[PDB]
Amino acid sequence: GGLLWKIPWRMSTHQKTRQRERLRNVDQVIKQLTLGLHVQRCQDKGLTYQEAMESKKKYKPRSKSLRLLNKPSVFPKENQMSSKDKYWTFDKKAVGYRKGIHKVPKWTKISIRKAPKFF
Amino acid sequence: VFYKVTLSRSLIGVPHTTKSIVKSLGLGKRGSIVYKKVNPAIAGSLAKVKELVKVEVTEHELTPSQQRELRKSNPGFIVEKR
RNA sequence: AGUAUGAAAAUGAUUAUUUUAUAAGCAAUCAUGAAUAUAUUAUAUUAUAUUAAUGAUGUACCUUUUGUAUAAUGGGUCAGCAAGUAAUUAAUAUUAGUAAAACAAUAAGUUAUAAAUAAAUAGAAUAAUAUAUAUAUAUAAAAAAAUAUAUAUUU
RNA sequence: UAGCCUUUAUAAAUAAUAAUUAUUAUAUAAUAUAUUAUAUAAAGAAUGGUACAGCAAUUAAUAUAUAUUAGGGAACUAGUUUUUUAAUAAUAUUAAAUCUCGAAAUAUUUAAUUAUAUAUAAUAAAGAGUCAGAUUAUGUGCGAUAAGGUAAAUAAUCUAAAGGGAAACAGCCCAGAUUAAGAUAUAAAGUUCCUAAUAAAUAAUAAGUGAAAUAAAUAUUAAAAU
RNA sequence: AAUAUUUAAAAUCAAAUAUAUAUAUAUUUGUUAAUAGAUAAUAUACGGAUCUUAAUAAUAAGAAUUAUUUAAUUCCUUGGAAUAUUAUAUUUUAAAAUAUAAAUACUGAAUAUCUAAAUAUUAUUAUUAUAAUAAUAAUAAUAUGGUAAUAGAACAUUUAAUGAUAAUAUAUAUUAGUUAUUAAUUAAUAUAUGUAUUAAUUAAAUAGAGAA
RNA sequence: GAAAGAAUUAAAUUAAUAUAAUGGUAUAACUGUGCGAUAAUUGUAACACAAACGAGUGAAACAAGUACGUAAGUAUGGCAUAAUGAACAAAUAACACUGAUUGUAAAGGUUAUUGAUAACGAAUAAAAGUUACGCUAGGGAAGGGUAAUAUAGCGAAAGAGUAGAUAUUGUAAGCUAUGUUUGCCACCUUCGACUCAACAUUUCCUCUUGGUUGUAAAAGCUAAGAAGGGUUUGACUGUUCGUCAAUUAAAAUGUUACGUGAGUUGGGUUAAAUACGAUGUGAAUCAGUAUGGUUCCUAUCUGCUGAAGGAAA
Numbered sequence A: 001g002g003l004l005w006k007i008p009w010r011m012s013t014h015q016k017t018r019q020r021e022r023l024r025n026v027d028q029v030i031k032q033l034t035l036g037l038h039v040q041r042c043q044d045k046g047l048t049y050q051e052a053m054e055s056k057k058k059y060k061p062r063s064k065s066l067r068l069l070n071k072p073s074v075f076p077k078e079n080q081m082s083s084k085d086k087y088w089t090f091d092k093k094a095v096g097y098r099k100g101i102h103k104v105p106k107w108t109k110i111s112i113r114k115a116p117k118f119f
Numbered sequence B: 001v002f003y004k005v006t007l008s009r010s011l012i013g014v015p016h017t018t019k020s021i022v023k024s025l026g027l028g029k030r031g032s033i034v035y036k037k038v039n040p041a042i043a044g045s046l047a048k049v050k051e052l053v054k055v056e057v058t059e060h061e062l063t064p065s066q067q068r069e070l071r072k073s074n075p076g077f078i079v080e081k082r
Numbered sequence C: 001a002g003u004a005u006g007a008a009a010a011u012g013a014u015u016a017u018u019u020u021a022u023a024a025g026c027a028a029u030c031a032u033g034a035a036u037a038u039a040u041u042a043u044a045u046u047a048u049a050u051u052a053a054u055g056a057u058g059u060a061c062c063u064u065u066u067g068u069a070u071a072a073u074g075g076g077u078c079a080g081c082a083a084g085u086a087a088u089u090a091a092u093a094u095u096a097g098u099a100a101a102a103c104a105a106u107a108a109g110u111u112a113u114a115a116a117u118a119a120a121u122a123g124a125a126u127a128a129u130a131u132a133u134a135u136a137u138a139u140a141a142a143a144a145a146a147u148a149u150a151u152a153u154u155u
Numbered sequence D: 001u002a003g004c005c006u007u008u009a010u011a012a013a014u015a016a017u018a019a020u021u022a023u024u025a026u027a028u029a030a031u032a033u034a035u036u037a038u039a040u041a042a043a044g045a046a047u048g049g050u051a052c053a054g055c056a057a058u059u060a061a062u063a064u065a066u067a068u069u070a071g072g073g074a075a076c077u078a079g080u081u082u083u084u085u086a087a088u089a090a091u092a093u094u095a096a097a098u099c100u101c102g103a104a105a106u107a108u109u110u111a112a113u114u115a116u117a118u119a120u121a122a123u124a125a126a127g128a129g130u131c132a133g134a135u136u137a138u139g140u141g142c143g144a145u146a147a148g149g150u151a152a153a154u155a156a157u158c159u160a161a162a163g164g165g166a167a168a169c170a171g172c173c174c175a176g177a178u179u180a181a182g183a184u185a186u187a188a189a190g191u192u193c194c195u196a197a198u199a200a201a202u203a204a205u206a207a208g209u210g211a212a213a214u215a216a217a218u219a220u221u222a223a224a225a226u
Numbered sequence E: 001a002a003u004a005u006u007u008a009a010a011a012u013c014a015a016a017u018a019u020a021u022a023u024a025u026a027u028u029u030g031u032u033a034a035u036a037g038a039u040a041a042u043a044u045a046c047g048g049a050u051c052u053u054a055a056u057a058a059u060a061a062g063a064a065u066u067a068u069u070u071a072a073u074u075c076c077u078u079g080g081a082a083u084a085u086u087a088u089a090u091u092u093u094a095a096a097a098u099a100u101a102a103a104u105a106c107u108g109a110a111u112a113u114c115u116a117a118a119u120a121u122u123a124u125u126a127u128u129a130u131a132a133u134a135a136u137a138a139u140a141a142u143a144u145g146g147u148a149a150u151a152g153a154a155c156a157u158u159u160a161a162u163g164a165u166a167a168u169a170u171a172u173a174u175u176a177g178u179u180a181u182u183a184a185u186u187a188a189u190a191u192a193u194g195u196a197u198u199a200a201u202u203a204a205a206u207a208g209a210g211a212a
Numbered sequence F: 001g002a003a004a005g006a007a008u009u010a011a012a013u014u015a016a017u018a019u020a021a022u023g024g025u026a027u028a029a030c031u032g033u034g035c036g037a038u039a040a041u042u043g044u045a046a047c048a049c050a051a052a053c054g055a056g057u058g059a060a061a062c063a064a065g066u067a068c069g070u071a072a073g074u075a076u077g078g079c080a081u082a083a084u085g086a087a088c089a090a091a092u093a094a095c096a097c098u099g100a101u102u103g104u105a106a107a108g109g110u111u112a113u114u115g116a117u118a119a120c121g122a123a124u125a126a127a128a129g130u131u132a133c134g135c136u137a138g139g140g141a142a143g144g145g146u147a148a149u150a151u152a153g154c155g156a157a158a159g160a161g162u163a164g165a166u167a168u169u170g171u172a173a174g175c176u177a178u179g180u181u182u183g184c185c186a187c188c189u190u191c192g193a194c195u196c197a198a199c200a201u202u203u204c205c206u207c208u209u210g211g212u213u214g215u216a217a218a219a220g221c222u223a224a225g226a227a228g229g230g231u232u233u234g235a236c237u238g239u240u241c242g243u244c245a246a247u248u249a250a251a252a253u254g255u256u257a258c259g260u261g262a263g264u265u266g267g268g269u270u271a272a273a274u275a276c277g278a279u280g281u282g283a284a285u286c287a288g289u290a291u292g293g294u295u296c297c298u299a300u301c302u303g304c305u306g307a308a309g310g311a312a313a
């Protein structure tokens, strides 16, 4: 290994904060998507925008992917997530079966919340 | 109701399927704002690119000209010709 | 190796301005003091020009390579010279001329005007769009595959 | 030659790209134990056999004061018991590139709908170049779970991409330079000084451990929980 | 206290979210540290300086390491409210009371916006003179890194065809201006020439050299 | 209640399939049996799959004829996926198409068939070696990485040690370091001697110290600190190395382009000459042996050794 890819094995505090913020943003996006759908469905039934926003009973999304994203068991929120799953991917060939998320290529775009139950 | 979707991240490190989805959605460059009438189809497409994009719901959409007008900064002066 | 002329450059010496004897690397660019020069509107607290205070950024150029600051190629510098051109043809395209004809006008020819078929004495609505017709295979004649031909004016 | 690139055009043109709907079940309401609507749940039309999971059948491995089949010993007067040797059965437990009876996600992929049209496909007439590739990540073959190794699979970047970060850096993290301007949002990465930018909270460390390239079995000393 | 394990949130408990809801069900989260082991040849090598805080005593420092977090702290549902803080002003006796503010952490690209300029296309205009056009100028949008390659548009140079003009001119050179500038033009200065095969349009090329 | 039939359910594709392996097959594609021996037929084949082209694959339908079946229908070889070869040039037939003045002919064409190019998209009907006498065009189409090996260490301790695993020793298996050996990779196209050495410490000697029923003493053995100083001369060989001789306090191990050829040498390795043994029909060749035998360099910069001038004191 003569070429030096000087990437540290762990993240800095600032990196971790940015990661957390990114995770929070994707959860927010999902929430907005569900909310807009609900609003649209209220309008279809025949309420005003404000009335729809007020509504006690929020409509859950019927499409599959959205419904999965809503579930925390499948796609957890940043507040829900463990410290470890925020900053460590599962890597079967690593010692500890764990690897920094920053070592994943395009980790800033690519999402990866859920690790295996005991790894 | 309308999703105001914004292409927050670039499409440089992004695979070709996700690029194609972004193109279909209508977003060109980074930070290129697009309003979309809400429906299941557009919602699912947005979910598919959830990490590149910032979405927020709105009462009304805006045409490109309106958006431009909103953007324009205040010229702090009033011309008086003589 | 003509004759005039020659502030063309490389190159040498000298003078002037400016910087330089505690500072380290493509010697430039950008920031920015100072010094000097020029300026018949510097009215100035001015403008331009020249100059390695000081600060920041800055790994020659080409070639060949997956990849070159490379200790890979090539160049001492400047001046001059040094590389997709012609002929005879064929196919496309664009325009222009003429146009069911064109070129040529002495005739002759080339292309077009009919599609086929290895080739032969075969060759396009019997009452209309293919469901008709022509050709090649086949045949008594159709059907069948293929391509072509037809819905005031021929293309 | 095809693949990928370019130019000029053609339409009784959206055929392209992306997603949704499509299914199953439950509850409620309305009609005729069925149908429709609404809401919710379910990795949700069709195709599949990798991961995972599993030991079924196949191929392999282990154990039985268990049973049967024979054999070798052994005690009394050929019969009999025990300590057994293998095989077979029974029961329990295990694994495999060429085992999958269970089984994902990603994937392949169809209709209509919506969204992309200052956008795509297809076709027609013409021009190319290229066929030494590299690294990173993931899943493998070879190698020794060695190589800046080698061989291909998928994605990205470099190739041909300047800019910010990673001390310096082809391939990593961001992000694509038409020309400026420099007020505002920022990305990745940073905020004691060098060096543009910082203040806090709660724990732990005392080894300069560490502070952007994490060195192992094991040992000692603590600390919690039982 | 002693012996022996484990270093765990599966179970268990605690806390939080979602469905009927003072409870039940389902989901999500929470379970050690230090040292030794330790190791080669130009020179210490976190990039370097340097970084573990300390009362008296500061209008003042107290990780710049590791782990979990925040953008002053605490409740309620990004937002408001309360709480103290900090700074400031006022009033009263260096303190107290009242009130105003700050709470949007910041840096950061050739990213995006704004601000202007250019070209190209699409869609609207305006002005001036296939007028369903051309030129120029507006507005909105999209696009403009590029090797191999493809396509489009220009300029310099030399010759041929046509061709005014003139030493107050032309050409070449130097210096300083000008025009979004390989080019040309203005002025000054110099040297030549009684003068552009000149401007412009065509036709062509021994038509552009830091790379053999 | 009994007999017979029709059968259904469960299981099975582990047998069998002309043939490998895989998929399929009991609704059988497997097996038996009647007829038959035909469809192991003739012209057009769309449309798909696959696909650079050349080819390859499945195939509806139309037309002619055939075999089986009461009929429905089925058959254009085999349950499927291998069982193969272009043109050119010859050859054989059929076709009635051309017939170089006309007629015949020849010769060519169409249709069907024939043999191989296995380096198997086949260059020709037909082609092996050698060069250290070689030549031209190009390409690189010890250092670096690795650490299997090697060297060193650590953990655990079977076992030796008169008794006791751990004074000293330490099987096989375990965890590391090193980049000193032999390899592997292919980014990257000279051994020894002399001379002068610089550096490391994993210490051979000298200094300090722990352990040593195996430290009585003296010699040792083993371990910790320690790089200040020191660490060989000869015979043999080109040798480093090694064997020995004589010494020494000791004759340590490396790194430095296995330091040092613009500093020396040139014995080894190395081309031209020649011979020998072996190999080859031979030219010639060799992880062979032997004699002979070719590079040079005035120092520009860095650096170092000395010596001046200038200077800001």
Ligand SMILES: [Mg+2]
Pocket: none
């Ligand atoms: Mg000085």
Ligand SMILES: [Mg+2]
Pocket: C024
């Ligand atoms: Mg110097």
Ligand SMILES: [Mg+2]
Pocket: none
């Ligand atoms: Mg050099």
Ligand SMILES: [Mg+2]
Pocket: none
């Ligand atoms: Mg060079």
Ligand SMILES: [Mg+2]
Pocket: C075
């Ligand atoms: Mg040279």
Ligand SMILES: [Mg+2]
Pocket: none
């Ligand atoms: Mg016929």
Ligand SMILES: [Mg+2]
Pocket: none
């Ligand atoms: Mg090609």
Ligand SMILES: [Mg+2]
Pocket: none
């Ligand atoms: Mg469609």
Ligand SMILES: [Mg+2]
Pocket: none
């Ligand atoms: Mg497999």
Ligand SMILES: [Mg+2]
Pocket: none
């Ligand atoms: Mg299965």
Ligand SMILES: [Mg+2]
Pocket: D131
């Ligand atoms: Mg290749």
Ligand SMILES: [Mg+2]
Pocket: none
């Ligand atoms: Mg490689």
Ligand SMILES: [Mg+2]
Pocket: none
């Ligand atoms: Mg290239």
Ligand SMILES: [Mg+2]
Pocket: D161
């Ligand atoms: Mg770059």
Ligand SMILES: [Mg+2]
Pocket: none
């Ligand atoms: Mg690119």
Ligand SMILES: [Mg+2]
Pocket: D176, E145
């Ligand atoms: Mg761009």
